[PDB]
């Protein structure tokens, strides 16, 4: 016995956690995000793509659409904190965004239902975007800073 066995042994029993007092409570959004807002994406593959905001999903994320006919952005989730909200808006009424949920995006080419829902949304949104001048060119444009851009001076 090259080490003398100890008398007291610590228990191998795990213990139950205390009844924690943290209720789940929903996100109080900042007021610059209203359905219809043209947004700017700061991260992901679609960085700097000007995009069209849609229904606030219930995993505290933001379902957005491109529309994909313009810039190349699908229906997608984007978190709220990674997004610069521009001031300019579009009308969103008439678009049945309220089908989708968290279950819709499921990690496992494209499942064809996604492209079908893309066309169904984007035809109404293109019919909305044609109503305002120069906006269809604007959403296709990427966003980046120039020299002498001071993003505290800049407004959105």
């Amino acid at each position: 016995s090259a080490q003398k066995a100890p008398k007291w042994y610590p228990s191998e029993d795990v213990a139950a956690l205390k009844k924690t007092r943290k209720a789940a409570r929903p996100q109080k959004l900042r007021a610059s995000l209203v359905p219809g807002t043209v947004l700017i994406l700061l991260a992901g593959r679609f960085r700097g793509k000007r995009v069209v905001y849609l229904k606030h999903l219930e995993d505290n994320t933001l379902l957005i659409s491109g529309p994909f006919k313009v810039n190349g952005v699908p229906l997608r989730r984007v978190n709220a904190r990674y997004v610069i909200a521009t001031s300019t808006k579009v009308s969103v009424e008439g678009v049945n965004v309220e089908k989708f949920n968290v279950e819709y995006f499921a990690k496992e080419e494209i499942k064809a239902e996604r492209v079908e829902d893309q066309k169904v949304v984007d035809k109404a949104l293109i019919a909305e975007i044609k109503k305002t001048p120069l906006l269809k060119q604007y959403l296709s444009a990427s966003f980046s800073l120039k020299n002498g851009d001071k993003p505290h001076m800049l407004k959105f």
């Binding site: 960085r47 904190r81 610069i84 980046s144 800073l145 002498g148 993003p151």
Partner: protein
């Protein structure tokens, strides 16, 4: 576009120091184009990444990144105290450094 930049560029200055002791756990960032502390209250929490190259390729890249964030203001001329996950190597005094816009508050 010819310009693809989504980050406000900035310089690195010395560490947090007195005359004769320096604290490596806090770095100082000089953001271009900021004057007051009130004009630097916008950059609070915006996440800083130092982007530097290397020689050996690891994980499919030669470019390595040290992440961190702005914690608070510093001085009257808009200098900024910023900490990192692992601190900047003190060779990079007067190196460029990136201050992203995410986490956006706007």
């Amino acid at each position: 576009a010819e310009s693809h930049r989504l980050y406000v560029k900035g310089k690195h200055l010395s560490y947090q120091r007195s005359k004769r002791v320096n604290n490596p756990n806090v770095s100082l960032i000089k953001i271009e184009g900021v004057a007051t502390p009130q004009d630097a209250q916008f950059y609070l929490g915006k996440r800083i990444a130092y982007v530097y190259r290397a020689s050996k390729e690891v994980r499919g890249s030669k470019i390595r990144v040290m992440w961190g964030k702005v914690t608070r203001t510093h001085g009257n001329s808009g200098v900024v105290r910023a900490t990192f996950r692992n601190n900047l190597p003190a060779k990079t005094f007067g190196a460029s450094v990136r201050i992203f816009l995410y986490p956006s508050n706007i």
